[PDB]
Every structure is written in structure tokens, then in C-alpha cells.
Amino acid sequence: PEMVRGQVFDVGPRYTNLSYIGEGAYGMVCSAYDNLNKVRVAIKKISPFEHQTYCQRTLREIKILLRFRHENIIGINDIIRAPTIEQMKDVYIVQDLMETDLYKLLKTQHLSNDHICYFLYQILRGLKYIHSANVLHRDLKPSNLLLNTTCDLKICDFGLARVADPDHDHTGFLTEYVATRWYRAPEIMLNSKGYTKSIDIWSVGCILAEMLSNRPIFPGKHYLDQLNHILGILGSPSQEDLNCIINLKARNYLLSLPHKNKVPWNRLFPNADSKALDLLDKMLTFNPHKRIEVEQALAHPYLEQYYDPSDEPIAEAPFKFDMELDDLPKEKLKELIFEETARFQP
Ligand SMILES: Nc1nnnn1NCc1cccc(OCc2ccccc2)c1
Numbered sequence: 001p002e003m004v005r006g007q008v009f010d011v012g013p014r015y016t017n018l019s020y021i022g023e024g025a026y027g028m029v030c031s032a033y034d035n036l037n038k039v040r041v042a043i044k045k046i047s048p049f050e051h052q053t054y055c056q057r058t059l060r061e062i063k064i065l066l067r068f069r070h071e072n073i074i075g076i077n078d079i080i081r082a083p084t085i086e087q088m089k090d091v092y093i094v095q096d097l098m099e100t101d102l103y104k105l106l107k108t109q110h111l112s113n114d115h116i117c118y119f120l121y122q123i124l125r126g127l128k129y130i131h132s133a134n135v136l137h138r139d140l141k142p143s144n145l146l147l148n149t150t151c152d153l154k155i156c157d158f159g160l161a162r163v164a165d166p167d168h169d170h171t172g173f174l175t176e177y178v179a180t181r182w183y184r185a186p187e188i189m190l191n192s193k194g195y196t197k198s199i200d201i202w203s204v205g206c207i208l209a210e211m212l213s214n215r216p217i218f219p220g221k222h223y224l225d226q227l228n229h230i231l232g233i234l235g236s237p238s239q240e241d242l243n244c245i246i247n248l249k250a251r252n253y254l255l256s257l258p259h260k261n262k263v264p265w266n267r268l269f270p271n272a273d274s275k276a277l278d279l280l281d282k283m284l285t286f287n288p289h290k291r292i293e294v295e296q297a298l299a300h301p302y303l304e305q306y307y308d309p310s311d312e313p314i315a316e317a318p319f320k321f322d323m324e325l326d327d328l329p330k331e332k333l334k335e336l337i338f339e340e341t342a343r344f345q346p
Contacts, residue, residue, distance in 0.1 A: 009028070014078075021042065028044070042098065043080075043093070047089065048337075049089065052333065055330050058091070065158060066340070071126075072155060073129065074146060103145075105142075113272075120207075121298075122152075123204055126155045127140075136162050136197060162195060182217075191246075234262060282296075
């Protein structure tokens, strides 16, 4: 089999001419030539079967990505694995090759207002579809927004995604969270498990702020730093917003803080389009019940040159896991991954 760095990358015969892109905790990514479609693609080698958590994340993401079909959500083109469960040690996922991501773009490039508007429209268009299926992404951030050389944008990395569950969203103060710190909504640190759609709208707001300035708006170094950043811009919550927080430890922590007044957005972003700032204000609302929903955001005047609800599809049915993937042994998960990937076998 073809080899890359130390490692076997056995994807022949359809895929040849491999080049290293990167590695991570989650596997190795290469580009390759697709001899069938005569284009270069991206392939990720995943080796998850020894670890129950890695199996869960892998199965969840495959199921979601195979079910969704939308221009602004990355798709799975092909999945390569051994013909038998006994011989399957790795899985290779094939996706369209996307040249860059919004994280890399922001590090290196000034965005025009026209690009900011188009990027935001595409994010919200994709998010409308995701939310319409009753799924929450939960880890929206610039590195999970892939771009090609014509600025087509695709949302990726659904490893932390969950079905919405408003009724079970409550929890106590300082509950652990897994998603990326700077893009976590305030309520995560206070009283929320992140099981409602409002947590994704917050993240989009953060992304919009970062596009306007090229830097993260709330770059907290740990928990109460993440909050004290937020409150230094938004100002101290009103009595009405605190009355929403029934848990005493969370409410009394917020009452213990010195008063902060709101910093107006136009002082932070003097070059920004006023319509962009109005929409930003509505996404970065402290109280999640007052936060704008995705459809209202698409209908906002900032996006009027793109808004077309007839070209902003919704899912044909809500999404549900046929099982709870938390309590299954890794051997059962291996079998399920085998079964889900069978449709790509010759
Ligand atoms: N699509 C793409 N182009 N350059 N980078 N990049 N994203 C990384 C990537 C490439 C190929 C396959 C990938 O698979 C991610 C994945 C991992 C587990 C389950 C389902 C999907 C990821």
C-alpha cells in the first residue's frame, strides 16, 4: 500500500498521488487524486476502535453527515475500509478538498464588508438547515468553517453535535463543558448544558465579531475569565435577566461582581457596517431567550441582498439517533460503524 510519513495510507486503487496536509489527535489528513472523478480530494485516516469515546464521536459524525444534504455543509464522498470487521482497523473518510478555513483566512487576510456579508449568509443558510433537523452543532468556530478558492463555505466537524433537548438543559454553576472556550455562550458557565439552539447563535455572533476585527472578541483564558470578558463588553445583566437564573450559586456569583456598563459596538468596530452591528447586537444577547433565531437573522436587513427563503432549504424530517451512543461497548460501536459504511463497498 501507498505510504505517507511513517504511516500506511491504504486507499488504492481509486485514490493515488497522496500529499500530507496535517495530523491531529483525531487522525492524519492527506490530499489525493481521485482517478474516477479526475479531481483532487481530501482523505482523513481515522483509527478509533480501541477507544469508546473516539468510536462514539466517529459514528455520530458519519450518521449526521450521511443524512444531511446541503451546499453549506461538508459531505462524505466515499468511505474506505476493509471488507470484514476482523480486518478493519482504520477508516478513511473522503471529502471535497477545501483549500482553507476561516481561522487561517482571519490570521492572514483583511475581509471586505462584501466577504463578511456573504460568509455570514452562508453560515446562517447552513445553520437553518441544521436547526430545522433539530440538531445543534455546539462547536461553531472559524476553524470549523471550510472555504474553497471561490469562497464557497461549508460547515464541518459535527463530533460534538446533539439533538436539541430544551427540557433537560438545566444544570448547576461551573458545570464542565467540552466545546471551544472562546465561542461558548455565557449560560454554559452558569446554568446550561448547551442543549438549545440559542447556543449556536451565540457562536455565530462571536464569529461575526471576529470577522469584523480579525481577532477573537472574548478570548478568555479559563472559565470566569471567559465570563468577565463577556460582561466587560455587554455590561452587567439587568434584574430581568438575572431573574431568569434560578440557581442561587450562579445568581449570587453575578451579584458579587462590580457593575460594568455596556460598551457600544460602534466604539469597538468603528469601520463596521451599521446593519452588521445591529445584527451582532441581537446575536450576542446575554439572555438566551432574547437571542435572535436563525430565520430572523436571515431576514435581517444586513443580509437583504442574499435572503431568499425559497432557496434556503429545510430538512425533510427531524434527525434522531436510533440508539443512545453513550452506553454501548466499543465492540458494538465497531459493528455499527461497519454497518453504516457498507453502502460504499463494491
Ligand atoms: N475537507 C477538507 N479539506 N481539507 N481539509 N478538510 N477537512 C478535514 C477532513 C478531510 C477529509 C475527511 C475528513 O473527515 C472528517 C470526519 C471524521 C470522522 C467522521 C466523519 C468525518 C476531514
